[PDB]
């Protein structure tokens, strides 16, 4: 009618205004850096100085922190430490205003989300005051974080997901392609803010699979229409959210182009491309004798060629040649002429340029032995022989002959000769016939815990382990552009490797870390700043009205899919009309699947997990709680006493999350007291809140 249009217009701006008030009330009060504003504020400061860095998370959240830096009048000059006050030129209130504006847009998007997943009108208001009045969302909204951004693109992913579901009756329409593309863009932004945005794309993806599964059942759907459904779902659900991801690494790689911290995680050609460039040399590449080099392995895990002064205790008693991964003067090497020819002298006139395909002897500078493989087997790998250094220019054998073999040339010069950083060369023995290889594993402690060097009989040229390049040259030129897909793959594999380095040791008590079963039932919270009586001190836990009742709604619905499934097998017909089945499927079932996909990896994985990882997984849980008010009280709408009891149960629980949000409000609104004034909201132990 006309009143429902009035509520449908003026009510989203009441919830919007309460989101602007709930997330921006004490933004500029703390005046100190907090939980991960120290990290992500620094990462946003890296984009303003255009300096390269490395981080676990995909860059769209950090590029939006940098976008808030451009919108805050800030040039990135101040790194963000922990605990310290802000300088006067950095206006942190604009950035906290920016991300609290993202959560302040996460609330009305939950209003229209609940307006989309069926939900007779009191359930939309309960779900909107349920996402709205929460101290966890309004705590992590308050800061320079990409947890608010991950929450916003997760809620936008589910909103455009149901707004894609609602035009399932009219496929290939303007609304169908519209919300399919908006679904793809929001999903790709959900990955590119943080990698645990894969989880929603599992859920949506499972939905997509079910659609294609049930599109086999349509006898009226032709094969042309069905293959068009496949092309539409792979375009707007695979091609688009991966193209947004690639575009975020295009703005990431093409935006920052200087040197910074974490620059050593890249191949040295990409490090040579950027403006800092502490790994390159201008005029010359390499020559004979006088060119002192340090040779790097291009494989993931390979390092510099090291030769320390000790000898082998296992073998023919020659010098140990291994691979070490830091700067050292003992990593220096140079080339010399082969066996039978007179070697290099320091008073030569012809600066000879090296020729590939010709044998040379790699002589170390600070020690002075020949690079060699000797007929004693390698210690760890018993298949191949062992690499050592022996003698000098006149003492050795015929097995010291190592050729230089061209694999790839990175243009802009003569590709026939050996070069620095533009020559992936293999080193092959002449008499034996083995390629110089590296296993990448660890050695025992006789060789000071360094890399294993082998020489395989028959490897293939498609292996990255035998490729070597010159990194440092010692006695007008711009390095070419690297491939963007290769920098994409190597930087993502470096992100995965830093995720492998994030596993904690069990001997150390991480005071900040938590387990996933503690995030429902509120066993522990999270302490986000310094707990002195001066600063306002903030705390992370949900309102125990929303996520206790939401947690028992998840446990009360996960044991309702089973009951309706048993009664389905017992020939009951539960959900007759497509309306209540639509509210079950989109309002109840897929938030249970998205709850499990956003929550169960955090209880399965062996990684450091915190309370702020539960903020997307709570959201779908809250939707389930709205469904536990929607279908659970739907039968009461026919009797007038059931109507009045239903509206006072909606208004009773909504008022209960008003009162329980407002009671626990200073842990999101600030706690300006001396931390002993706030023991009244210290209900349990392990809530280290006072």
């Amino acid at each position: 009618s006309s009143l429902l249009r009035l509520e449908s217009v003026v009510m989203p701006v009441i919830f919007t205004a309460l989101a602007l008030f709930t997330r921006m009330y004490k933004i500029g009060i703390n005046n100190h850096v907090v939980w991960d504003e120290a990290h992500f504020g620094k990462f946003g400061s890296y984009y303003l100085r255009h300096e390269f860095y490395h981080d676990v998370h995909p860059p769209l959240g950090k590029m939006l922190v940098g976008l808030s830096g451009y919108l805050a009048g800030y040039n990135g000059s101040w790194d963000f430490p922990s605990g310290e006050i802000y300088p006067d030129y950095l206006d942190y209130v604009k950035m906290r205003l920016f991300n609290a504006s993202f959560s302040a847009l996460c609330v009305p998007l939950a209003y229209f989300t609940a307006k989309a997943i069926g939900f007779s009108l009191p359930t939309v208001w309960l779900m909107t005051v349920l996402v709205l009045f929460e101290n966890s969302y309004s705590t992590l909204g308050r800061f320079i974080l990409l947890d608010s951004m991950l929450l916003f693109f997760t809620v936008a992913s589910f909103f455009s997901f149901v707004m894609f579901h609602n035009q399932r009756s009219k496929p290939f329409s303007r609304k169908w392609w519209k919300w399919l593309l908006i679904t793809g863009i929001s999903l790709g932004c959900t990955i590119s803010v943080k990698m645990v945005g894969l989880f929603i794309i599992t859920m949506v993806g499972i939905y997509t699979v079910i659609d294609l599964w049930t599109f086999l059942a349509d006898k009226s759907m032709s094969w042309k229409t069905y293959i068009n459904h496949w092309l539409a779902r792979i375009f707007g659900l695979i091609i688009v959210p991966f193209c947004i991801f690639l575009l975020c690494f295009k703005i990431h790689f093409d935006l920052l182009s200087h040197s910074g911290t974490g620059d050593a995680n890249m191949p040295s050609l990409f490090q040579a491309r950027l403006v800092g460039s502490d790994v390159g040399q201008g005029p010359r590449d390499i020559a004979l004798g006088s060119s002192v080099v340090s040779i790097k392995n291009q494989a993931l895990g390979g390092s510099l060629l090291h030769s320390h002064i000790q000898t082998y205790p296992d073998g023919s008693n020659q010098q140990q040649v291994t691979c070490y991964g830091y700067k050292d003067a003992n990593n220096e090497w140079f080339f010399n002429r082969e066996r039978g020819l007179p070697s290099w002298s320091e008073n030569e006139t012809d600066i000879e340029y090296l020729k590939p395909g010709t044998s040379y002897r790699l002589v170390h500078k600070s020690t002075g032995r020949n690079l060699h493989t000797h007929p004693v087997a390698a210690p760890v790998s018993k298949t191949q022989w062992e690499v050592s250094g022996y003698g000098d220019n006149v003492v050795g054998d015929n097995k010291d002959n190592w050729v230089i073999e061209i694999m790839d040339q990175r243009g802009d010069e003569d590709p026939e000769k050996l070069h620095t950083l533009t020559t992936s060369f293999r080193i092959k023995n002449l008499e034996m016939g083995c390629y110089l290889a590296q296993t990448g594993n660890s050695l025992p402690e006789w060789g000071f815990r360094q890399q294993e060097v082998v020489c395989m009989k028959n490897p293939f040229k498609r292996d990255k382990r035998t490729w070597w390049n010159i990194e440092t040259h010692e006695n007008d030129f711009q390095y070419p552009k690297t491939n963007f897909l290769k920098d994409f793959i190597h930087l993502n594999l470096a992100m995965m490797a830093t995720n492998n380095a994030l596993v904690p040791d069990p001997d150390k008590f991480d005071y900040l870390a938590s387990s996933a079963w503690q995030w429902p039932t509120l066993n522990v919270g999270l302490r986000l700043c310094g707990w002195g009586d001066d600063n306002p001190k903030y705390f992370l836990l949900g309102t125990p009205a929303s996520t206790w009742a939401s947690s028992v709604a998840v446990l009360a619905f996960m044991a309702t899919v089973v009951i309706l499934l048993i009664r389905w097998q017992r020939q009951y017909v539960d959900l007759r009309n497509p309306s209540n089945w639509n509210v079950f499927l989109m309002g109840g079932f897929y938030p249970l699947l998205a709850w499990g996909l956003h929550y169960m990896p955090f209880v399965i994985m062996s990684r450091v997990t915190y309370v702020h990882h539960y903020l997307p997984a709570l959201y779908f849980a809250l939707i389930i709680l709205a469904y536990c008010f929607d279908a659970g009280l739907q039968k009461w709408s026919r009797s007038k006493c059931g109507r009045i009891m239903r509206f006072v149960l909606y208004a009773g629980f909504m008022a209960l999350v008003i009162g329980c949000f407002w009671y626990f409000s200073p842990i999101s609104f600030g706690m300006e007291g001396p931390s002993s004034n706030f023991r009244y909201l210290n209900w349990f132990s392990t809530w280290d809140i006072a």
Binding site: W213, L216, A217, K219, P506, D507, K508, F509, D510, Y511, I566, Q569, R570, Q571, V573
Partner: protein, 731 residues
């Protein structure tokens, strides 16, 4: 042999009834004389094959030293610690002592010839006899699963011929009792399948499924995966019983609750009984209980655990601290220096009692008083032997050097001449992990569990499970860590004595090992060793290379003979080829089903897909958890899943004979006689790798089909004739 489906009409869709007739029970059991004659012939053939040439490897074989030596530990009674549950080691102890075995032979290392005092051929006979009964249980399991008589005959003959079970069952190994009780669990549960779930026969089959299922679970922890397999099978059967409308709801809850009682309460009951016979028979104390708590060891006989120590401890008492969480713990300090840091006197966790574990509690500031150790008392630990304090200068740790936390603690000081504030240790009693009373207030020996906070660094006294190789071998590390784990920070005091206390002092001793604490503590050591079992065994295999039979494991090499585990490959590759073909054909039946074409019309195809989902699920639940294990594992961990694979391939030969060659069953029997004949040919060719009998080298080179498996192929002679003129060495 298999009946037609009995589907009825529900109010919405047709439902299948799940009450089998008595005719279904009569067609699948030994009701005739020809079937009993073929079980007799299969038991004669299996009893020849699985038991041939026994005691010809008259030395110990791979992991016969372990479970044989542990059987010797049960006969001697001295306590040992092993990964595995007791029943299939204590069972070799009962088979040993029933044959006249009195310990006396430590099963040391592979190659030790048996003296004429140890019964091994009777233990080998027990292992190979259970490995010969699992063949007959595969025949009867398969026939109970709904299967032609002759195809189960030829498939079970094809299972007695499988090489990996003759190798794994012939020797003193855990997988032949394990595989017997797993085969008895699928046996008794398929016997439960064919009964109408209300009669007394079905509850006898649930009772045998319970005692065999938990007698598999108490032999090795892959039997818990058979508990999981039977459990998912029961979710299947309760799903179809809910689908059945002629069954009342009270009957479905009765089958579900009696199924829950016989299938979890009986495995847990038999598991607790078998650990009670474990803890009841293994009474003595040896070096095997080196890493248990002193209350655990307090139940064992012939103890060196200190009993009746002085409870109330004062300042001036010569005490000995002991680390709670790490089992090898005492505060230890002897005159040998570090190679790094300050190179002072080292502080270690030495697990045994010495005089160097003694520490005076002296005040920071000797009187005639007895000042108690209250909560918050800063003291100094004065080592009485080497004349030194406990000192926590901020230098590099010895072996945990990559630590921004974990400050290093050492020993340096002069009594009365060099006493500073950097030797102070505030005692902070943890009031949760200590027992309440006086010990929760002040320090009591064996009863409180305090934490030593260093007073001038704010860091606590810490230790963990990393030893020190520099000096003081097999001794751990003492540090002073901030934000170290609260479990690893707890210390408690024992073996205290001071002259400022009367002789009639209230002594204290340890709680003596309650069974639940014995049980849970023992299982924490089970899971702790089983989780942290990383060793370089060159015959270690990979779980994703098991279903292709490349690079099998080696067993024994002596006197120009060798024993090597490599399964029957022409059966192995048809098991896993049938995993691929059945997965592909059930994908094409789902796509072909929903695309519009009808599937599952003939009842033999329905029972085929039902039982191969049942056995493919046994292949899944016994092999998929072997990927989520961060430990070492070999080819004999695939083998409980491989039993379900040869069950499923049994049904594959049944769908070759029974459905796709209905008009011409001579060609189905031709396919099964070529598969069986090729299997028995693979056994007859690879018989001298199982029993440790003579091959020749010119055939040992030819037999290696894949280059993956390699078993010291130059060990054999040039011909068999040289084996008759041979004397053999005995280690």
């Amino acid at each position: 042999p298999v009946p037609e489906l009995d589907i009825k009409q529900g109010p919405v869709r047709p439902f299948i009834v799940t009450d089998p007739s008595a005719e279904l029970a009569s067609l699948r059991t030994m009701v005739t004389l020809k079937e009993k004659l073929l079980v007799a012939c299969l038991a004669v053939f299996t009893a020849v094959i699985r038991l041939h040439g026994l005691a010809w490897p008259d030395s110990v074989v791979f992991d016969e030293v372990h479970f044989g030596g542990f059987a010797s530990q049960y006969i001697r009674g001295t306590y040992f610690m092993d990964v595995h549950p007791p029943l299939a080691k204590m069972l070799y102890a009962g088979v040993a002592s029933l044959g006249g075995f009195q310990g006396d032979f430590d099963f040391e290392n592979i190659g030790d010839s048996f003296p004429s005092t140890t019964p091994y051929v009777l233990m080998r006979f027990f292992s190979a006899s259970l490995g010969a009964l699992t063949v007959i249980l595969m025949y009867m399991t398969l026939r109970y699963s709904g299967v032609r008589m002759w195809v189960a005959l030829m498939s079970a003959i094809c299972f007695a011929v499988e090489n990996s079970y003759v190798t794994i069952s012939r020797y003193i190994l855990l997988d032949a009792p394990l595989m017997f009780f797993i085969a008895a669990a699928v046996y008794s549960f398929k016997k439960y399948e064919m009964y109408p779930a209300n009669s007394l026969n079905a509850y006898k089959s649930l009772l045998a499924t319970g005692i065999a299922l938990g007698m598999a679970s108490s032999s090795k922890w892959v039997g818990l995966f058979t508990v999981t397999w039977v459990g998912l099978l029961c979710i299947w059967r309760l799903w179809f019983m809910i689908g059945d409308l002629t069954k009342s709801s009270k009957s479905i809850f009765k089958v579900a609750f009696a199924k829950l009682a016989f299938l979890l309460g009986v495995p847990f009951a038999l598991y607790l009984v078998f650990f009670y016979i474990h803890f009841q028979s293994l009474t003595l104390d040896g070096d095997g209980a080196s890493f248990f708590s002193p209350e655990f060891r307090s139940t064992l006989k012939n103890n060196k655990i200190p009993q009746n120590v002085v409870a109330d401890v004062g300042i001036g008492s010569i005490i000995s601290l002991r680390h709670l969480s790490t089992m090898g713990g005492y505060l230890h300090s002897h005159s040998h220096n570090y190679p790094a840091g300050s190179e002072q006197q080292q502080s270690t966790l030495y697990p045994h009692m010495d005089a160097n574990n003694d520490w005076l509690l002296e005040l920071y500031n000797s009187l005639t008083t007895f000042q108690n150790l209250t909560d918050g008392t800063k003291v100094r630990l004065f080592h009485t032997v080497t004349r030194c304090r406990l000192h926590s200068h901020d230098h590099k740790p010895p072996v945990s050097e990559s630590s921004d936390w974990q400050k290093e603690v050492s020993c340096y000081g002069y009594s009365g001449f060099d006493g500073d504030a950097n030797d102070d240790w505030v005692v902070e009693i943890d009031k949760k992990n200590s027992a309440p009373g006086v010990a929760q207030e002040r320090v009591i020996a064996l009863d409180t569990k305090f934490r030593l906070r260093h007073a001038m660094t704010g860091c606590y006294l810490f230790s963990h499970e990393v030893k020190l190789p520099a000096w003081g071998f097999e001794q751990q590390e003492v540090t002073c860590a901030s934000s170290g784990r609260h479990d690893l920070t707890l210390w408690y005091v024992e073996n205290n004595s001071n002259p400022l206390l009367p002789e009639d002092t209230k002594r204290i001793s340890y709680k003596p090992a309650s069974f639940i604490s014995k049980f849970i503590e023992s299982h924490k050591k089970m899971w702790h060793i089983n989780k942290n079992l990383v060793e370089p065994h060159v015959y270690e295999s990979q779980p994703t290379s098991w279903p292709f039979l490349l690079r099998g494991i080696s067993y024994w090499g002596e006197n120009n003979r060798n024993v090597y585990l490599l399964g029957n490959a022409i059966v192995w590759w048809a098991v896993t080829a049938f995993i691929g073909i059945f997965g592909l054909i059930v994908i094409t039946e789902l796509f072909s089903w929903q695309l519009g074409k009808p599937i599952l019309k003939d009842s033999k195809v329905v029972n085929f897909h039902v039982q191969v989902i049942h056995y493919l699920l046994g292949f899944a639940v016994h092999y998929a958890p072997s990927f989520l294990m961060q430990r070492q594992m070999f080819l004999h961990h695939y083998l409980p899943a491989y039993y379900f694979g040869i069950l499923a391939l049994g049904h594959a030969l049944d769908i070759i004979v029974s459905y796709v060659f209905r008009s011409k069953r001579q060609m189905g029997y031709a396919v099964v006689i070529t598969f069986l004949a090729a299997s028995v040919y693979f056994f007859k060719s690879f018989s001298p790798i199982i029993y440790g009998t003579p091959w020749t080298q010119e055939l040992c080179q030819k037999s290696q089909w894949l280059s993956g498996w390699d078993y010291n192929c130059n060990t054999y002679f040039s011909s068999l004739e040289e084996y008759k003129n041979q004397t053999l060495t005995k280690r």
